[PDB]
Design a protein around this ligand. Structure first.
Ligand SMILES: Cc1n[nH]cc1-c1ccccc1
Ligand SMILES: Cc1n[nH]cc1-c1ccccc1
Ligand SMILES: Cc1n[nH]cc1-c1ccccc1
Ligand SMILES: Cc1n[nH]cc1-c1ccccc1
Ligand SMILES: Cc1n[nH]cc1-c1ccccc1
Ligand SMILES: Cc1n[nH]cc1-c1ccccc1
Lengths: 546, 546
């Protein structure tokens, strides 16, 4: 029975294959057929290309050897190479044109998700070209999705040598009959077949996946659209910055490029951004996904005033200072979205660009108490229930599993009365004891939140809602200002508290405001519609944040 | 008695002052004298500029108001503003031209070092211009060196209003007679003088520093060249990455830009790079200063084989993978320098550029055992003393304070026989019990190393020296290769083990190799000559790493 799947890189996980480009170059240059492909494999096991693939020499050392091979091949065939013939130019162009074969990677992902051990087995080289980064990027993206990466130039062996196949089996800890092996080269497939492995000769991707589906008994073609890559907490880089003697902020960090600071809402975690972190890093950004003050591995001081917007914003400025960052793009959701607008208003020089999911920017009304304003909208009734220290902490901490399962639900899975709350006496009056698992979250994801909240509970988080008067006084100082830095407002059609209509007047205060809108999306935007969130954020970052 | 020093930003810590540029623009445009300076201060406490400085409006909102003021001023004076008159262009240019007044900052640094509380008190604005980053960078660099930064636009008060001065005193927790106040504006200096503060009217920096020196009784002018900014461990961002089930790597992180991975030697710490970390981040790089495997907060497994170069290099590749970095510049010293050459040789695609301090690149001799080679050079005798598990651990762990004080010494402060070692029976035979403190290190810096080494001791560190045969076998695979990526070799004149002469044949293997050389420099390069190291590294990074 199959339990491992092995994929080649060139012509399988990345397209197009070398044989095709050498063929195309020959056709473009009107060279004798097979000349370049012939000079490339010249000397077989004793040739320059074999030395390169075994890691005896680097790619830059191999270029001049390939050039000699081309000249010998041209001399024997009595033809002339064009005056401006450059192997370097040809090879630079072909490497950069090579892209991940997305449906093949999709199939590898599905097999692993079903319990298969997956590996990449490739005849590759040590790339020291000035343009090597393009290749490093492709390999870094690809490799993360597999259990193993076996590179000919690292192991000192090449396909079709029999030893690399026994090495592969040793690495997989599998018998040949338990392995499917996919390769676009018939000669490289043969030794695997000779050992008793299932082999797939890859020409067109669709037929290869049909053969793969048939042999594994797992549907790989025509499948529903997969979710974006998520995060495994234990595999992330965890960062810790002391912003003041009693306060440290924890963050998860991924990628290179402009700094993008993600700010979660209530009662959440850096983990609420799990589907955005890999996508934004792959899009060319350095992601800093915070545990906001009062949450997860960040400090959670007990005092209400430690959670006013002025204090929270000052600490995020200190966070940047200590990291040596002059700016960051600030992206927030819910209370994180509230924080990001205030960062834009009070610290524009430190904010490269600002984006909020669900949370609109509404200027403080100096002629009305926030308490007065809140009471007028019945959907904000829970905020009044949250005021009394200890009451909401007791209900929310009673059963963490129940709390998160009740909260984290799609628009059609509501389980709690988002009413009063106060008069019903609790957010969970008439709510199930053991709610059903939302289609949005797995049991494992719920248990992560449960474990995070065992450290500090709900006091710090609830304190974000206990500074209404103080926040209002501070916000009143900004009434003569406008937000003129790049800004994005993302509305969620089915957030029944932070309704899209609440954002309708934002252009009065943010004239250059850009927008996104997500249909059939509840309050938990990032995990409700991750694909849509990623598309909106990346498009906006690439156009307005650089 | 004075115990606090307050500095203005414009015309004191940053030059040149606004009044001068407005004057220059008037002269350049042949405008009536004082026209622009007049439109700028128009309306005094009720004017647009006061609203801007109090933070009522942002800089972008203030530009159009300043333009109207200019037109009213031109109308009354019966003159015409040129057709292409742009306040935006003028102000953009003046902000970018403004630079830190280095001697003034030097004096502020010296006063704080002597126990003064230091602060910046500035009439500033909320910058939302597309070019705001230039200013954010200047402020971020400046602010780190002071106890307080008081900005008019954050506190809603301006100089010369009396309240800002009482606010300043409250912040400093000082009586007016304990404060020196430096300002280039006479009107802004007056309220401080009226309270009883010592005041310095700053015109030319040298005279201001003479007045400052006289009043504080501390030499500030003509002082010896200061050391580069160091690191306070508790103020750094600390990162942690699990590279394998039992191994986590710790690093300190600072700055934005291309990733620069610093790799310390034996028996050191990320802290050995303390003078490089702020300088390289300020130079525009994202510094990742490692605790190498076996050190500080990184894991220290007991097995010798966990410390072979092949394993160490693979883990540094995993470290990059987990951080989502396709490449990093690798800079190493001693064993870190050995690691970086092997990273360049085995993982060129992951290495943006490579630099080593002291450690040369010498290819493995396949016709000789490393043990054979080592024995031939008497300066490497200690490496033979290090071979036996437990012997060197016992001597080095006996008294950590003694160990680090004996090791970390300048070229003229040698305290140990760097002889055999074996026959003398210990690195500390005939060495003092309580060595004198080297001019290179403070007691506090020594105690940091002492505290780091209490966690894992010397087993992991010494294991770096216990893989000679294994490292030699692995290095022999790379004999046909050359290092063709950007590379820098830095020699230290007075390193009596890793002598500059050992690097003499490197161009045979690294044809494009660039070099640096440090005179009167012992083995501990980074702390021996930090200014020189910073100059060499930054110049090289800017030309070859980007
Ligand atoms: C920020 C926020 N997140 N969720 C609900 C929120 C609020 C907060 C104050 C007032 C109205 C609504
Ligand atoms: C916590 C919260 N803040 N704002 C809205 C919230 C919701 C929305 C839907 C279901 C539960 C909770
Ligand atoms: C309380 C309030 N009233 N109006 C606006 C308010 C804010 C402002 C900043 C942060 C939270 C809430
Ligand atoms: C790397 C290193 N750092 N210091 C001394 C070193 C060595 C190591 C092996 C062989 C000779 C010299
Ligand atoms: C540890 C070490 N490795 N190489 C050279 C070393 C020195 C050099 C001078 C003084 C003490 C130790
Ligand atoms: C032992 C040895 N002999 N020659 C070169 C050697 C190396 C190579 C890599 C790392 C440490 C030492």
């Amino acid at each position: 029975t199959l339990r491992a799947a092995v994929f080649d890189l060139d012509g399988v996980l990345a397209l197009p294959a070398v044989f095709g480009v050498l063929g195309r170059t020959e056709e473009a240059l009107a060279l004798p057929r097979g000349l370049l492909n012939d000079a490339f494999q010249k000397g077989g096991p004793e040739g320059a290309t074999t030395r390169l693939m075994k890691g005896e020499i680097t790619l830059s050392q191999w270029i001049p050897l390939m050039e000699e091979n081309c000249r010998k091949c041209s001399e024997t065939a009595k033809v002339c190479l064009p005056k401006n013939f450059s192997i370097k130019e040809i090879f630079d162009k072909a490497i950069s044109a090579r892209k991940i074969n997305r449906p093949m990677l999709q199939a590898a992902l599905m097999l692993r998700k079903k319990g298969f051990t997956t590996a990449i087995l490739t005849n590759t080289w040590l790339d020291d070209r000035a343009e090597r980064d393009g290749l490093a990027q492709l390999m870094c993206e690809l490799k993360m999705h597999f259990d193993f990466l076996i590179e000919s130039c690292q192991v000192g062996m090449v396909k079709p040598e029999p030893q690399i196949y026994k090495f592969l089996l040793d690495t997989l800890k599998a018998s040949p009959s338990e392995v499917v092996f996919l390769d676009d080269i018939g000669a490289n497939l043969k030794p695997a077949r000779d050992l008793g492995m299932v082999t797939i000769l890859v020409q067109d991707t669709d037929t290869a996946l049909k053969e793969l589906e048939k042999v594994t008994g797992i549907q790989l073609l025509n499948t529903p659209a997969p979710l974006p890559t998520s995060c495994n907490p234990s595999d992330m880089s965890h960062g810790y910055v002391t912003v003041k003697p009693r306060v440290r902020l924890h963050f998860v960090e991924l990628g290179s490029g402009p700094a993008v600071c993600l700010c979660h809402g209530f009662p959440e975690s850096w983990y609420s951004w799990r589907y955005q972190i890999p996508a934004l890093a792959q899009a060319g950004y350095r992601v800093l996904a915070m545990d906001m003050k009062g949450y997860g591995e960040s400090s959670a001081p007990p005092e209400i005033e430690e959670y006013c917007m002025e204090v929270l914003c000052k600490e995020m400025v200190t966070f940047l200072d200590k990291l040596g960052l002059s700016q960051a793009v600030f992206i927030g959701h819910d209370w994180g979205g509230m924080l990001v607008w205030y960062m834009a208003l009070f610290y524009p020089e430190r904010v490269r660009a600002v984006a909020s999911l669900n949370t609109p920017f509404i200027p403080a009304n100096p002629n009305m108490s926030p308490l007065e304003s809140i009471k007028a909208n019945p959907v904000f009734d829970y905020q009044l229930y949250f005021q009394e220290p200890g009451v909401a902490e007791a209900e929310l901490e009673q059963n963490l599993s129940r709390t998160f399962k009740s909260l984290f639900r799609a628009s059609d899975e509501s389980v709690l009365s988002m009413h009063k709350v106060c008069e019903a006496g609790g957010l969970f009056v008439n709510s199930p004891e053991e709610p059903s698992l939302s289609r949005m979250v797995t049991e494992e994801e719920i248990q992560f939140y449960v474990q995070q909240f065992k450290k500090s509970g709900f006091r710090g988080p609830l304190n974000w809602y206990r500074n209404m008067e103080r926040n209002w006084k501070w916000a009143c100082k900004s009434l003569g200002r406008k937000i003129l830095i790049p800004a994005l407002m993302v509305t969620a059609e089915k957030d029944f508290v932070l309704v899209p209509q609440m954002s309708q007047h934002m252009e009065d205060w943010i004239p250059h405001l850009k927008r996104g809108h997500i249909e059939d999306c509840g309050h938990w935007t990032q995990m409700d519609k991750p694909t849509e969130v990623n598309q909106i954020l990346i498009k906006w970052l690439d156009s307005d944040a650089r």
